[PDB]
Amino acid sequence: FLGFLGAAGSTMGAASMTLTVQARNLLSVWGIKQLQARVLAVERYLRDQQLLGIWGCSGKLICCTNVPWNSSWSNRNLSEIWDNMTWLQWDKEISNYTQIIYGLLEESQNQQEKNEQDLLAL
Amino acid sequence: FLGFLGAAGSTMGAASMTLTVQARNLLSVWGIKQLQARVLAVERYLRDQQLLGIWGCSGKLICCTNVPWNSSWSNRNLSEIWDNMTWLQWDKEISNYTQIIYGLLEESQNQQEKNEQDLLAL
Amino acid sequence: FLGFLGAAGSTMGAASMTLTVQARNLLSVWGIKQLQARVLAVERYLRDQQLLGIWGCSGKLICCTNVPWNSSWSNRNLSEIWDNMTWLQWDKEISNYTQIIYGLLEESQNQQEKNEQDLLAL
Amino acid sequence: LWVTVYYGVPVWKDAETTLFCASDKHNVWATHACVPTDQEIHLENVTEEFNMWKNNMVEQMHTDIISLWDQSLKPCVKLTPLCVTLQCTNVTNNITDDMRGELKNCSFNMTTELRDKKQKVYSLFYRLDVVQINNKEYRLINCNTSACTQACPKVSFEPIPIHYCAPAGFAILKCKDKKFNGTGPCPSVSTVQCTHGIKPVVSTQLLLNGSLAEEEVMIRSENITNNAKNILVQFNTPVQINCTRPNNNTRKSIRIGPGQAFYATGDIIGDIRQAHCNVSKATWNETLGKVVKQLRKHFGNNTIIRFANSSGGDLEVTTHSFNCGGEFFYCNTSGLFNSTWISNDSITLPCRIKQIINMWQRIGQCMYAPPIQGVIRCVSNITGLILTRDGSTTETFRPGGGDMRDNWRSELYKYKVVKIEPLGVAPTRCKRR
Amino acid sequence: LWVTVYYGVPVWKDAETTLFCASDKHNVWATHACVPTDQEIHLENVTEEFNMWKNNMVEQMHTDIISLWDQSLKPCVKLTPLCVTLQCTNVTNNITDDMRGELKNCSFNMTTELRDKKQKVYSLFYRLDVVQINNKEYRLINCNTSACTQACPKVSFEPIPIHYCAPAGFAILKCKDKKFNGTGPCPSVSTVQCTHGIKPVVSTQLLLNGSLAEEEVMIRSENITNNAKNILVQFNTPVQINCTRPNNNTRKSIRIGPGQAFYATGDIIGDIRQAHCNVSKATWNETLGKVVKQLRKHFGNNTIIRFANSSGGDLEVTTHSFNCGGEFFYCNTSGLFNSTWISNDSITLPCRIKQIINMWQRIGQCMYAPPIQGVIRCVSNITGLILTRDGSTTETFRPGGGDMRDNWRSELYKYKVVKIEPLGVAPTRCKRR
Amino acid sequence: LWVTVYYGVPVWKDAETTLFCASDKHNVWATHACVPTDQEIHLENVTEEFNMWKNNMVEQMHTDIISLWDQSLKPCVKLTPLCVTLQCTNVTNNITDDMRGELKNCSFNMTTELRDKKQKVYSLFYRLDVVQINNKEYRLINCNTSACTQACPKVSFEPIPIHYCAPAGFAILKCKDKKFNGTGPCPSVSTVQCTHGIKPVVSTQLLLNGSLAEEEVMIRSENITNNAKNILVQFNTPVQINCTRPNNNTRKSIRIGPGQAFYATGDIIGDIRQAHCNVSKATWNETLGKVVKQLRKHFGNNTIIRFANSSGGDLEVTTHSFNCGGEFFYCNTSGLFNSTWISNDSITLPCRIKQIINMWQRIGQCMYAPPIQGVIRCVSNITGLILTRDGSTTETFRPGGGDMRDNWRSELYKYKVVKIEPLGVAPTRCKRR
Ligand SMILES: *[C@@H]1O[C@H](CO)[C@@H](O[C@@H]2O[C@H](CO)[C@@H](O[C@@H]3O[C@H](CO)[C@@H](O)[C@H](O)[C@@H]3O)[C@H](O)[C@H]2NC(C)=O)[C@H](O)[C@H]1NC(C)=O
Ligand SMILES: *[C@@H]1O[C@H](CO)[C@@H](O[C@@H]2O[C@H](CO)[C@@H](O[C@@H]3O[C@H](CO)[C@@H](O)[C@H](O)[C@@H]3O)[C@H](O)[C@H]2NC(C)=O)[C@H](O)[C@H]1NC(C)=O
Ligand SMILES: *[C@@H]1O[C@H](CO)[C@@H](O[C@@H]2O[C@H](CO)[C@@H](O[C@@H]3O[C@H](CO)[C@@H](O)[C@H](O)[C@@H]3O)[C@H](O)[C@H]2NC(C)=O)[C@H](O)[C@H]1NC(C)=O
Ligand SMILES: *[C@@H]1O[C@H](CO)[C@@H](O[C@@H]2O[C@H](CO)[C@@H](O)[C@H](O)[C@H]2NC(C)=O)[C@H](O)[C@H]1NC(C)=O
Ligand SMILES: *[C@@H]1O[C@H](CO)[C@@H](O[C@@H]2O[C@H](CO)[C@@H](O)[C@H](O)[C@H]2NC(C)=O)[C@H](O)[C@H]1NC(C)=O
Ligand SMILES: *[C@@H]1O[C@H](CO)[C@@H](O[C@@H]2O[C@H](CO)[C@@H](O)[C@H](O)[C@H]2NC(C)=O)[C@H](O)[C@H]1NC(C)=O
Ligand SMILES: *[C@@H]1O[C@H](CO)[C@@H](O[C@@H]2O[C@H](CO)[C@@H](O)[C@H](O)[C@H]2NC(C)=O)[C@H](O)[C@H]1NC(C)=O
């Protein structure tokens, strides 16, 4: 057990062992200063859960999607990504491609939401 | 792309294309007043998500259920509901049947919770 | 219908059919008091939902898990647990082992989250 | 067997939390800012441990009642100009022997709207409010300690019922047992969204306008054997006490600044008579007989129960201090507790009235109660006692009080705040696929 | 057919919420606390029922403007030492006939920085600010009602546009219909992130610096047949009004205490002339012709439309009370409303300046506006009217005002707050497996 | 390869947020209202960029310490009556030549509880607190600017450690590098739930009771080449400084109103001597030798390092102003910085004491520090310097300060607040079925 953010320097393969360690630490006039910080934490947490919900990833720490990895975002092979890089290095590389990926995940789920909805009526 | 509430005047079939647009804007003298508006936004959002989870619809925008449509609620056929009316018109029609439908969905999922619990026991 | 906490004296089997009752009353100078109590209710609700999510139990009231019962936590059989005891009596007996099971449920889901993740790579 | 997670189980732990208002002319306890009211769920087979002497509902209510009291006193006139030299004479106009020397006619130089102009005014001050400096020169008692904030005449002191409601995720358990001593298991437990209307009636030595016991008189102490603990007696039937101030007061407004006005007693129209309270001699005697009968259960059948009056101390603890009609009474209550018990007529308790009030035992925060014009009559219920026992075959019980938490401990004894634990894990043959 | 749950449906209903400020030297309506601004989506096929006379944004704006007002008057000087006897003479040095006996040269004793020392100072006070008490002896107009705060010299009274933005889960519907009369279905609805810049311009009898109508003059009343209801006129073309205070006032700082300064009118450099406002006679006449044309649609083509001046009452309601330049003008609009309508030159409105200002119709809270150094000129836009009809073939319309919610009802008439209800259930051939 | 979503990844972005308290008789920094404390996670392979000169932790702490300072001064006596004329004589009773003319014996007429009665009292006032009006007449320095709120004798000025803890979703990164100049990459990063106990020690020209460097003296400037930037020196070993006020003051309570009391110096019991601070000559000399040796690394080996005393300005910036024992000292510290460096005994620094304190450089809000009964002795640690360089082969370093953010920049240099970004997307061979 490494602790909160302990696997920050680990490789992304090894850092994915401990997603639940970081996940559980995101939730928990002077009274107002503390009180506004609590509300900010709650709504920041709920926006990330809402994003997972609209991608069909709610309640999952690791979620598989139906969006193929465009090589424009990163052309590096699978081996030099999960065994050589850390999550901090990776976030800086696809920072500009993050928003276009988020839209693709949202568009892939609502396509699946209806394709399952249509097939379920047969 | 129509925007937030853009499909308000569209037919429910066409307005069901854009549920994500409305879903993502339900979450996010000028002090406590602004702070309590944020807490009220979170509480309303959490009570709607709690209802979906109780009906077995957590993490979904379109959730096909097992409750049959009582013809007393609305005798209209699918052709004139999903291609002739809007969601605002529909809400007016079944405003009084909303609570009895909510109880039907709540009890129906509760029966599936124990039905899958018994099947998994074998 | 019994009402909120009505099945507190009911047996564990009979009290587990009214989980939707207790679930929906967990969410809903002198202005901060009301406001800070509302924020604490939201934070507590989200911490219990987060626990269910990391156990694979998100969106469910009765959640089947893969963690076996050690019988060192309670040697009693099903007949004398689900037909004689109440949930208040049961909670006072496994209170010592609660955090032991909570860690096994989290550990089991993480291993299951990847055994399923590795299965889709074939 | 496999672990199964249940969410929404009826399990609770004891917890402390912030309860909010509910309430069904402004009042001191600002119920207008408090939310409106609306619900009774009986819990069969539930046996819960209650403890009225370690109930945090009492300590929270004490803080709220104090906080609401000094919140309605912020937008009120601070009587800093009232600390001057008072040249006081004795009101001897149509005076009675009992009221001889209690009322004083004090003249003083006062401010006006205009800073450069003074004002020669006079007011009738009670003997308890003015202290002599050594007609003779006096000064108000509230002047070497603090400055009194005059009570706003539009804000009412009348206690209106308030409901303390638990937030989401918490429940209030109500003990429906009719023979509950305030401690131990309660076979009849029920849950409420929140409590009955609890009037914050502030009084000492006598619980006025409270809740009555269902069947018999209830004696509730933290431990009977310890004399240092107060005894909370609760009556099954009320004893009505008729309060009156026979004097016909005149309220004279004295303008002490731009805005600020000071309301003073001008002249009393007619005869001067002492304030008093009347308790039926038969109704009080029967009640003390019932109090003794359930009090012998803790001290033996052969013991001698003696009722004596208050030992000593401040006027607030030695007298049945209360407030109704806007004036604050301080009644002797020595004829109420004067009897020894072995195994149309009324009792008149002479009361004294103060206008400078230190209400929550706080020092440095006083309040001036403006005079009430006319004659004040008041009818309330004696619904309990706050007795103290002293350390033979006889036991002496003297009235107690002072600590206002005992007044609201007699209303919140049956209530209890619990924290709902909806997450539970139990074994089942079912397995996740 | 089976019940299918949809989350995120475009459904709303009328709701009341606390909209938060947003805004694109300190100001009374603080923009520092208002969040920065950033937006509009057209809703085809959407017909929404608006009601400007039951809109809660107006009531929520009235509380916010008042609350924004008096919290900005908390930290700065309370002029309670200015309630004294004033030895006032008449200013006859270079005064015109019109403004004769309107300024008073009042001398008084002021408190110094040092408590024991006294300060003999003089100041120029308007006739509207001082009342004689029986050179003659005077005192300020509001010294028997309240002591009251000097307007803080560094905060600004200039209206800054503010955007009222709905929180999450709420939407603001904007009626884009150009001939909307404030009530009824609006065929052209759009949702905006929040409202346009609504300047909190305080005015009476004339809506200054407001928003203009798109096509024609809009007449808006809650019930056009009810004379007791005010009539809100909106101009399609603005009528500029040129305000002025010709006197060259000199601001003099009087040190009335430790850290407190009182700003007094020293002396006018030059001749004493009356403040006035100019409205073009041709522009006003053509505007009233447009107002009458749209005012005949509710009363007939043959009805005689008569404009008269204010019926009577307070100076704030009988005059075009407004503020610009820091001084509060009270202009006499009897020349604007004097005409009867049947089927280069300018209008000069004599104004009066006042320094003790009570503006939200609250007795007990005055504000002392300090003198403004120099000469004040001011150019505004008359963008509407607040008319009142008298209780025959002749209808008489008199300017109204007083109720300040009508001034902001003319800006929030096209807006509506709705609550999004995203949980909808509809039948489908779906069946959960 | 397919996009897969990971939630809970260890990724953070640099962010600014509101940190809350933690703390393990009331104090000015209200740690009672601050939550209790409790946790060290080392981050291997993590290299993080720190910047102590653009750290929002410092700016938040400045606002928090200020807001906590003026919050304990709200329920305290406002010394408005103390702005009177003071008839002051020079204390010449057992005076030493150094203290000749520093203490003045001031008599004045003071208010009483009774409004109509005056009070001729006297007090010993320091020369720095009274300014002469032209025995001779004086007045307190704090009387043409503001009124001082007397420090409450029960609230303490002693700095107790406080911990600034990040809310949920935020982390605090701690540089564990022992040779960190406060900027650039940090090879050894660790995360904490929150910081070590940072005492808000208020001082100038000398960082008292701070944290020591681990191995060598650390010179941390925003850029050494710029002389306009202060230089934060940090010592590896502390230099203790012994503060004392030899005078045996007598605290005399003067009742200036109902409630309100004013604490004045009555008489000094015995001999009167100057306050001073002692620094060991050998310990200071070796420390300056270590400061120079790590200071030659930025200016060359052949440069001449000269230490001169403060240039000029206010007494707060030209003197080592600090507070311990309740009195506020202002020590010369000219023998500390007087030396030129080429490639049992003590230093006594004469200190002056003020009672009217303008502490956070604000103008218009002062404090009167009540006298401390007895003799004050004080032992502290000099754990750093705040030097300023001036624009040849020699460099002159004079003590700086004033800006109090530099005092807490020396404690928050190793700390950094980040925002956890737990949502990450990466490519894998896994596909959703
Ligand atoms: C206990 O409760 C009783 C009633 O439940 C209280 O008596 C009531 O006290 C109120 C407040 O003083 C009286 O209202 C007043 O009535 C007079 C009548 O002239 C009126 O002039 C005042 O403006 C005000 O409305 C009420 O009449 C009175 N009722 C009775 C039957 O006496 C009593 O004060 C309570 N005792 C406490 C709180 O100690
Ligand atoms: C209606 O709007 C007009 C303009 O939109 C307002 O006139 C403007 O008022 C401001 C504030 O009094 C003037 O600013 C001032 O200008 C003077 C002279 O330059 C300067 O000394 C002051 O420090 C301040 O900056 C501004 O010049 C003026 N603009 C004009 C007259 O064209 C008018 O006050 C508004 N009427 C209302 C709110 O009733
Ligand atoms: C730096 O820290 C040292 C100790 O860590 C501080 O010295 C201590 O200061 C406190 C507050 O004045 C002293 O407490 C007082 O002690 C006297 C003794 O008679 C007592 O009468 C008071 O009621 C109070 O308790 C403490 O004794 C003292 N300790 C030592 C060893 O001197 C010093 O003030 C700090 N310097 C700063 C903050 O500038
Ligand atoms: C109010 O003030 C006046 C004076 O301001 C007091 O009258 C004085 O009384 C004393 C007796 O103690 C005489 O020696 C003075 O000559 C009086 N001064 C006058 C009459 O101008 C008066 O006693 C005060 N009243 C009260 C009630 O305190
Ligand atoms: C300001 O104070 C002065 C002195 O107190 C006033 O002048 C005196 O007023 C009194 C009124 O009773 C006269 O009897 C004196 O003759 C006046 N002169 C002196 C030298 O005392 C002056 O009237 C005050 N001004 C105002 C406006 O109140
Ligand atoms: C306190 O006030 C008294 C008067 O209220 C002052 O005594 C006066 O002193 C002046 C000298 O400047 C004399 O002309 C007066 O005759 C005195 N009045 C008396 C004695 O009643 C006294 O100086 C003040 N004390 C201080 C310390 O300022
Ligand atoms: C600072 O140091 C000086 C000198 O070393 C101390 O002064 C001496 O104090 C002792 C005790 O009071 C006397 O016996 C000596 O005669 C003093 N010497 C001189 C030269 O004055 C002083 O007490 C020290 N201050 C401290 C330690 O706070």
Ligand SMILES: *[C@@H]1O[C@H](CO)[C@@H](O)[C@H](O)[C@H]1NC(C)=O
């Ligand atoms: C740091 O890197 C080394 C070498 O790659 C690795 O063995 C170690 O586990 C890493 N530390 C953490 C905390 O992952």
Ligand SMILES: *[C@@H]1O[C@H](CO)[C@@H](O)[C@H](O)[C@H]1NC(C)=O
């Ligand atoms: C409005 O209704 C018309 C009627 O057919 C339709 O063609 C149009 O698409 C609708 N607009 C929107 C935005 O749905």
Ligand SMILES: *[C@@H]1O[C@H](CO)[C@@H](O)[C@H](O)[C@H]1NC(C)=O
């Ligand atoms: C359908 O609704 C009617 C009332 O609207 C009710 O009487 C009937 O029982 C319902 N049918 C079913 C199957 O629930």
Ligand SMILES: *[C@@H]1O[C@H](CO)[C@@H](O)[C@H](O)[C@H]1NC(C)=O
């Ligand atoms: C209480 O216990 C009895 C006997 O077991 C049972 O029949 C009854 O349902 C219980 N009450 C509740 C509310 O569970």
Ligand SMILES: *[C@@H]1O[C@H](CO)[C@@H](O)[C@H](O)[C@H]1NC(C)=O
């Ligand atoms: C006035 O009454 C007081 C008691 O309040 C008494 O001590 C005093 O002697 C009385 N004075 C008379 C009767 O003259």
Ligand SMILES: *[C@@H]1O[C@H](CO)[C@@H](O)[C@H](O)[C@H]1NC(C)=O
């Ligand atoms: C109150 O009654 C309960 C129930 O028998 C008992 O357990 C408890 O000891 C009693 N408390 C006192 C103080 O007598």
Ligand SMILES: *[C@@H]1O[C@H](CO)[C@@H](O)[C@H](O)[C@H]1NC(C)=O
């Ligand atoms: C000032 O002039 C007005 C009007 O001419 C008059 O009523 C008033 O008495 C005059 N006052 C003085 C002090 O001359």
Ligand SMILES: *[C@@H]1O[C@H](CO)[C@@H](O)[C@H](O)[C@H]1NC(C)=O
């Ligand atoms: C406003 O217009 C609506 C719809 O045309 C109409 O019903 C209402 O009477 C009008 N109001 C007035 C005051 O004319």
Ligand SMILES: *[C@@H]1O[C@H](CO)[C@@H](O)[C@H](O)[C@H]1NC(C)=O
């Ligand atoms: C306003 O002016 C008109 C015409 O000049 C006049 O009749 C009226 O009296 C004036 N108003 C006041 C309050 O004098």
Ligand SMILES: *[C@@H]1O[C@H](CO)[C@@H](O)[C@H](O)[C@H]1NC(C)=O
């Ligand atoms: C009193 O001390 C001051 C300096 O504080 C000095 O200017 C003055 O001359 C002294 N007066 C004497 C010694 O009489």
Ligand SMILES: *[C@@H]1O[C@H](CO)[C@@H](O)[C@H](O)[C@H]1NC(C)=O
């Ligand atoms: C501080 O040290 C780092 C690490 O070498 C360096 O990058 C940075 O420039 C230094 N800053 C200064 C002001 O010298």
